[PDB]
Design a binder for this molecule. Structure first.
Ligand SMILES: CCCCCCCCCCCCCCCCCC(=O)OC[C@H](COP(=O)(O)OCCN)OC(=O)CCCCCCCCCCCCCCCCC
Ligand SMILES: CCCCCCCCCCCCCCCCCC(=O)OC[C@H](COP(=O)(O)OCCN)OC(=O)CCCCCCCCCCCCCCCCC
Ligand SMILES: CCCCCCCCCCCCCCCCCC(=O)OC[C@H](COP(=O)(O)OCCN)OC(=O)CCCCCCCCCCCCCCCCC
Ligand SMILES: CCCCCCCCCCCCCCCCCC(=O)OC[C@H](COP(=O)(O)OCCN)OC(=O)CCCCCCCCCCCCCCCCC
Ligand SMILES: CCCCCCCCCCCCCCCCCC(=O)OC[C@H](COP(=O)(O)OCCN)OC(=O)CCCCCCCCCCCCCCCCC
Ligand SMILES: CCCCCCCCCCCCCCCCCC(=O)OC[C@H](COP(=O)(O)OCCN)OC(=O)CCCCCCCCCCCCCCCCC
Ligand SMILES: CCCCCCCCCCCCCCCCCC(=O)OC[C@H](COP(=O)(O)OCCN)OC(=O)CCCCCCCCCCCCCCCCC
Ligand SMILES: CC(=O)N[C@H]1[C@@H](OP(=O)(O)OP(=O)(O)OC[C@H]2O[C@@H](n3ccc(=O)[nH]c3=O)[C@H](O)[C@@H]2O)O[C@H](CO)[C@@H](O)[C@@H]1O
Ligand SMILES: CC(=O)N[C@H]1[C@@H](OP(=O)(O)OP(=O)(O)OC[C@H]2O[C@@H](n3ccc(=O)[nH]c3=O)[C@H](O)[C@@H]2O)O[C@H](CO)[C@@H](O)[C@@H]1O
Ligand SMILES: [Mg+2]
Ligand SMILES: [Mg+2]
Lengths: 801, 801
């Protein structure tokens, strides 16, 4: 029973109210001309208007048995199929017409909701579609709105760009077919001896997903608002940047929408999230990009059984509570999550000269690939011209930044005034990777992107000077740039700092002054295990794949968790001993004396202050639970975050997806067939003249000496990226080691000090380093706390107005 | 002018004498039946007897213008072509007949000379062919020989197995055609809808290479002994093991020769080398394998301009003078060079049960490859059965040993008495790689092979117990096994030992007792550069290819050479200071006192003794020049040998040649054509019944829940080999570091010692380690010296008898 009566859950009371506000009796479509086995394709393109299944029409309320058509409008009766051969670059240049703009009265799009899909299960697509449909129903129900209200569904288009014709999951395809967008027969591989790049299906579906259980998806036609669906199935997978090219460069130009919303399969927006994003864009005309709070689902996951899920939950909550508000207050957000964000279409458009955010974003796809262009592609000229252009370090490595480049390119425009804003009213829920390998692979992409984006923005900070912002705005943008520079410096030396803190804390327990016997043996054992884990992580990152050697990573993570617990114990013990010593001294006890004590101060005051700031920020946002349920897991996993993820990310900076190539010869000399008789039919030279001529040709060929040939080939790009990655890790290793040598004198530096002065000189440097690092962390926390408080105050003030 | 009058060089006086001993007027071939465009292929196989070019026949002395045939025999007039489809396993089972055995009177082969070729220049092939032809002429000229003499060329077959139909160099193919073996037209790709695995051309050429200059090759028919040529051109490259399978498993069974000789393109044997190898096999019936001295050409290479060539020259000379004689004396040679060696055919044959040296040798090819068998291959059953068999660690990694496995498998047979012998009378000259990358790639293959062969032989030493050898023979074989165990242990810890020696020597100069000011700063700088070089070598070995990043390796090698010079200087300085201190003490000077002095003893006596042993061994073999011309380069390159080559070899234990695979979909849904009118011809569903049935099918498909699917796939073999390589480097790193920590207390061990006792406890361990390592090297040198002296004495005694 695919179709079941509509049922509202406990949380669907708002949906019920929306339904009460909507009439549900005036879903009348606009008449449009159809396309006529011989078919009259429009403008020389293959276009087919096929009829939808009779059962699906019979489900619709407007269906009437008496009328053969059923009384339904043309758009509700026929689904349109178009075969696209040109590709994104020339889609607008060719006369490719989408149905929304083909009506006698053109429809102007107000909100384009892009969904990216790749071999995703039907459950994830069902959840995303249910969220989008609920949002559209809410927008329709809205009464006292200038832009929204009756017939609001005509201004909204849902675009699903599936990457990979043969990689799409069968069940998701079945679901889309059940909605009526897709039919199996229509697909065509080639048209007029030209490859079909993408298959586009268009239909205004009136089928709504009633519920999405864990295993099955139920669809019902009762109380469903029509939704314009565009399903663009790509013939071959070209990653996500190519899908975004299809969305922006090709479909966006034809539709010319406002406020393009980007979604990802499995991300379920709230009931009013899209309205909140639209309102954010509408209130302030300067806003060019926006993002919403992203949450992690914890439905059937236990606190103890899934430490990783809760660690990620805490990370997401802290990010949304501290980082995004501060950057939004400054007006420049480092990263807008690709799972849920929104952009204003006009802001992204390139300049007359051809330079703009979209050009920078797309260049990464072209440059980061094998230099093998098929001459038959119609985009051959564009790709050849792009490859012939002189590319520097930054241009040729844009693929690391990905969408992150867009944020900076928007803020620091030549003569434009744009800002990026974060709204906490918009919420979306997603499933985080439970397994360790997927987490490692996912964070590998985030870390590389963040590092490259930070470097690129910092190096090009001067571009904001020419932007038409207020002078105070530029001053505060420079303050934020300085903060990001400090954050980058702190993140670059994370592994060295972690090792230094661990070594100092463990060796401090070895001192005979405090009464801890196993200090020394434990410190030595932990040092050996630490070095072994680091070396194994490097070797596995360079050599093997995470999926295969997962148990090694699990063991390393467990060891680092135990080591973190031991480090916390050592710090507490060290502080207690220091406090006890002051009382044992016999001196007067004052508040200045506690602050004067470097050990107690650094170890306790800084960490407690950071925890208090996190706690207060969590409470002020009415989101306190993560500070209890998921704090411990995050604390215990932090060293793994710094060591394993960072090492794996840097070791694989190059993402070499393409493989080796081979011309593989195959001259078609010929074949020998066998007749009924034993004789074989062959074709070999017979005439003596031909044989003698061939022999003389061979003699003349071998008579002359071999001319020199100097290989001056451009070579392949995989070597270039392998080289870039190798240099980065080497510089990363060298700089970290220099810092470690200075602080601990591990290298030859101990040769310059005396044996009696070695013990006294190592201690002072360690204390200075500990205080510096801890107070740097604390001050960054305070900075973000002030940021978030300002964001709350200003948002409340704007709401009041 | 391809053909020129024969000219004899200064060194061709022996060739002139050979010519004087040969009549050159009775080169009469045996009549054989030919094969009849329709051709009557023999036994259902595609066989063609085409006529050779008229000019080539006209060159031959026996040609007569009056007779249309020319008076030449059938074999000299027609070249035979055969297309082989089955492959090596079934070549004998099918009725594939080679010309030498097809005569009315069968010819018994006495010497099969195999030459392996792959995209080699025509110069290398010309040199090899000139050497082989000169050897055949010498064998023919021999008068007072029971086996050799008149008509000796009938007992010798030269087999050229070219790997890769489309990778063979054009000029070498032109040369072979000029000889008359190859013609372009004959090749056929498919026969009876079956792929042609190999193309075999047979011809008894009477064309001899007069000379081989640096650039061109000249051929002349004057004073040439006929040679039986078999040119087996493979359709696709399958590395060298597959070529050896063609030689042994398929061609050898048909010909059934004795004493198969293996050669490599560019290796030029001496004028009497093949006779020496044959005599070695003939004298003693127990000998199953033999090898000869291999020399490095130094024609147009300067002493200073090519340090690498002279380093390799010294290495080869020392090997031939010390290692091979000792192993030959014991009767078991670890490696028989693949460039020039010989095997007795019957010794290699497998047992009735199917287990034997050849099976072990070939299993490596099958196991070490992608598990993708084409069902159309006729060897599908064999490969599938081999893959289904349970393979342990050793069986699945045989590909590392390569031919090395054969030596041990021959010596330690179940019930056979076989020995391996080295003869210094046989000499062959080859070109060593001048570039650094090629040297790195070539040594990468040697080191992996040697390590795995040593481990395999040591683990299975007990197999020699069942062999039918004399008890004393088994005792001495066990002595050799013990020596090889010590050598393996010494080689495993080479990198750690080198670092320890460098550190001890450099830090010794830092002591204030001796008056050297820059000691400390230089030691620290060198430590930093050493660590940087090691880390960069690891990273580049894992990440990049040697050809691309060659300058890094050049810089590292130059640095290591400078460091070696500095280490030698430090040792000399340390010894001089120690000798001076004894005189400054004021005590009596005796010979016992010098020996008592650990510093002087270890540093000077051991190294001088090793050098003296090398010098004496070189002189006794009448090969003294390498001890002067090329010693310094070898000494300066030794640290590079240990560090760079060993690191690169271990980092790339897995040799993953095969690439990724993709089914790549491509369902043939259909195409749409365009008619003269605008209408497009398409095929899409029309009947309502079919559409409704498809829709109901989709509904039923999506209605049921998704059943669980647990991935229990066997997976790919590349992960297995990546895993094996990763473990090996990790164990290699761990064991070396443990030794370093013990000797220098680098790890946490210094925490267990006092500051005043740290300086005194580090010195004693360093002295003990230095004496141990140096005297181990010296004693191994003495062992090999005694070995070589015994070899000389016994060889001279055998010659006298
Ligand atoms: C009880 C509460 C203890 C809290 C300790 C938590 C340590 C967190 C360290 C840290 O965050 O360092 C800052 C930086 C990482 O920055 P962050 O924003 O947190 O991570 C981004 C995730 N994508 O990464 C770094 O720079 C790491 C700096 C070194 C961290 C050393 C941690 C030492 C642990 C001392 C515990 C003392 C406990 C005292 C309790 C009283
Ligand atoms: C950090 C320290 C890590 C120490 C090793 C933890 C290993 C935990 C474990 O149980 O892993 C076993 C793992 C299983 O291997 P397997 O899954 O069968 O390989 C499939 C290939 N596709 O792997 C194995 O079965 C091999 C067992 C380990 C081999 C020796 C490991 C030495 C590495 C430490 C070097 C220290 C430097
Ligand atoms: C990559 C991830 C690991 C990075 C580790 C970086 C190591 C920096 C070493 C700093 C250092 O100088 O260590 C001290 C030592 C020099 O001082 P030393 O005189 O030997 O000892 C003084 C005793 N108080 O220097 C040393 O200890 C030398 C270190 C050993 C070099 C060995 C090189 C060949 C073998 C490679 C082993 C790989 C490591 C395996 C670890 C498990
Ligand atoms: C201790 C706490 C000290 C807090 C001190 C700052 C408090 C806010 C003061 C706001 C004054 C704004 C003056 C101004 O004109 O700045 C430019 C911009 C308004 O002009 P705009 O709208 O961009 O263009 C017209 O206005 C802005 O750009 C406002 C940017 C505010 C960023 C606040 C971030 C606070 C967290 C960092 C603390 C350090
Ligand atoms: C051992 C110490 C080695 C130090 C580096 C020696 C470099 C010598 C040199 O001149 O090499 C330059 C090399 C040329 O690079 P290129 O050929 O243009 O790349 C082609 C990519 N297919 O490479 C370059 O041009 C890049 C220049 C070096 C980049 C920084 C190297 C830092 C590595 C040291 C890390 C220490 C830990
Ligand atoms: C692989 C090829 C390199 C192998 C190197 C192996 C290093 C073994 C280290 C042995 C060791 O224990 O070093 C000493 C130190 C511990 O003793 P510590 O108290 O810190 O110093 C005593 C001062 N007399 O231990 C240390 O110095 C710790 C070494 C640094 C670990 C850093 C890990 C993250 C950064 C990686 C840097 C990579 C190395 C770059 C070198 C250039
Ligand atoms: C100080 C120098 C001390 C040298 C002491 C050894 C001198 C040679 C003594 C030779 C006695 C041979 C006795 C014997 O029967 O051994 C077995 C084998 C002869 O028997 P076989 O031909 O194999 O079968 C029948 O004969 C053999 O296998 C001979 C093997 C000789 C290997 C000599 C290697 C010397 C270098 C290592 C020095 C340690
Ligand atoms: C948290 C979340 O909900 N999604 C993020 C997660 O995705 P996640 O870790 O779940 O997996 P991916 O990054 O591979 O997928 C990202 C998006 O790209 C699409 N895709 C994937 C593979 C492919 O060959 N072609 C293709 O188009 C996927 O369908 C998905 O819509 O890590 C990515 C790393 O960049 C982010 O970009 C995504 O925003
Ligand atoms: C010193 C010398 O003179 N030859 C050695 C050298 O060869 P070298 O370093 O010169 O180059 P290779 O090892 O690649 O060639 C070895 C042999 O295998 C053949 N080949 C090569 C590639 C291929 O795809 N197919 C193929 O059949 C080559 O033509 C040659 O006959 O290092 C090899 C490492 O094992 C040794 O085996 C060779 O004995
Ligand atoms: Mg996902
Ligand atoms: Mg070669």
């Amino acid at each position: 029973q695919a179709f079941i009566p509509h049922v509202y859950d406990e949380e669907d009371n708002d949906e019920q109210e929306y339904d009460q506000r909507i009439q549900y009796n005036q879903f009348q479509g606009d008449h449009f001309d159809l396309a006529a086995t011989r078919a009259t394709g429009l403008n020389g393109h293959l276009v087919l208007d096929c009829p939808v299944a009779d059962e699906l029409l019979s489900k619709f309320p407007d269906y009437n048995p008496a009328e053969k058509s059923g009384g339904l409008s043309r758009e509700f009766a026929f689904m349109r199929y178009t075969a696209v051969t040109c590709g994104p670059s020339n889609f607008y240049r060719d006369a490719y017409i989408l149905r929304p703009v083909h009506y006698p009265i053109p429809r102007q799009t107000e909100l384009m909701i892009v969904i990216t899909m790749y071999n995703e299960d039907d459950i994830l697509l069902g959840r995303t579609l249910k969220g989008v449909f609920k949002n559209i129903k809410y927008l329709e129900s809205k009464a006292r709105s200038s832009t929204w209200g009756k017939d609001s569904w005509k201004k909204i288009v849902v675009c699903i760009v599936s990457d990979g014709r043969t990689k799409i999951n069968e069940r998701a395809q079945a679901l889309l077919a059940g909605l009526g967008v897709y039919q199996e027969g229509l697909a065509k591989s080639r048209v007029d001896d030209k490859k079909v790049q993408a298959h586009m299906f268009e239909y205004t579906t009136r089928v709504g997903i009633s519920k999405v259980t864990d295993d099955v998806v139920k669809l019902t036609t009762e109380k469903v608002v029509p939704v314009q669906m565009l399903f663009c199935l790509k013939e071959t997978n070209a990653k996500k940047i190519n899908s975004h090219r299809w969305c922006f460069q090709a479909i966006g130009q034809v539709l010319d929408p406002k406020i393009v919303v980007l979604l990802d399969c499995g991300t379920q927006p709230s009931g009013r999230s899209l309205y909140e994003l639209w309102k954010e864009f509408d209130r302030d005309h300067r806003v060019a990009g926006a993002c919403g709070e992203i949450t992690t689902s914890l439905k059937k996951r236990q606190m103890i059984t899934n430490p990783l899920v809760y660690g990620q939950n805490f990370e997401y909550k802290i990010s949304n509570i501290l980082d995004k508000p501060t950057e939004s207050s400054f007006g420049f957000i480092s990263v807008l999550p690709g799972a849920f964000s929104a952009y204003r279409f006009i802001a992204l458009q390139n300049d007359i000269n051809g330079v703009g955010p979209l050009e920078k974003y797309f260049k990464g796809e072209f440059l980061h690939s094998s230099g093998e262009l098929d001459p038959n592609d119609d985009e051959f000229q564009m790709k050849h011209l792009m490859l012939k252009e002189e590319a520097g370090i930054f241009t040729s490595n844009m693929y690391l930044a990905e969408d992150r480049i867009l944020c900076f390119e928007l803020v620091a425009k030549r003569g434009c005034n744009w800002l990026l804003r974060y709204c906490k009213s918009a919420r979306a829920e997603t499933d985080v990777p439970e397994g360790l390998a997927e987490f490692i692979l996912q964070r590998r992409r985030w870390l590389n992107g963040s590092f490259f984006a930070a470097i690129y923005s910092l190096v090009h900070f001067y571009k904001v000077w020419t932007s038409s912002h207020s002078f105070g705005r530029k001053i505060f943008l420079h303050i934020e740039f300085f903060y990001q520079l400090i954050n980058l410096i702190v993140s670059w030396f994370s592994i060295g700092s972690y090792f230094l803190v661990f070594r100092i804390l463990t060796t401090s327990l070895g001192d005979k002054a405090l009464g801890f016997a196993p200090g020394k043996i434990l410190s030595v054992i932990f040092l050996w295990l630490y070095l072994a884990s680091i070396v194994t992580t490097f070797v596995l990152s360079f050599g093997n794949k995470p999926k295969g050697t997962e148990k090694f990573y699990v063991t390393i993570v467990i060891f680092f968790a135990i080591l973190m617990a031991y480090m916390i114990f050592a710090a507490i013990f060290m502080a207690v001993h220091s406090i006890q010593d002051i009382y044992r001294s016999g001196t007067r006890i004052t508040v200045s004396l506690f602050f004067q004590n470097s050990e107690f101060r650094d170890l306790v005051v800084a960490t407690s202050s950071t925890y208090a700031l996190y706690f207060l920020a969590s409470f002020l946002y009415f989101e306190p639970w993560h500070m209890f349920t998921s704090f411990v897991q995050y604390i215990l996993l932090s060293p793994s975050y710094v060591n394993v993820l960072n090492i794996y990310a840097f070791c694989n900076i190059d993402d070499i997806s393409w493989g080796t190539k081979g011309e593989v010869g195959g001259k078609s000399l010929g074949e020998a067939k066998l007749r009924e008789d034993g004789t074989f039919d062959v074709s070999v030279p017979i005439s003596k003249e031909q044989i003698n001529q061939s022999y003389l040709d061979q003699l003349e060929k071998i008579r002359d000496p071999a001319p020199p040939e100097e290989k001056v080939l451009v070579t392949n790009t995989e070597d270039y990226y392998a080289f870039i990655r190798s240099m980065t890790v080497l510089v990363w290793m060298f700089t970290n080691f220099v810092v470690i040598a200075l602080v601990l004198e591990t290298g030859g530096f101990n040769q310059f000090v005396e044996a009696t002065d070695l013990a006294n000189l190592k201690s002072n440097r360690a204390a200075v380093f500990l205080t510096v690092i801890l107070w740097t962390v604390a001050f960054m926390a305070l900075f973000r706390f002030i940021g978030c408080i300002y964001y709350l105050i200003t948002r409340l003030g704007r709401e009041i107005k």
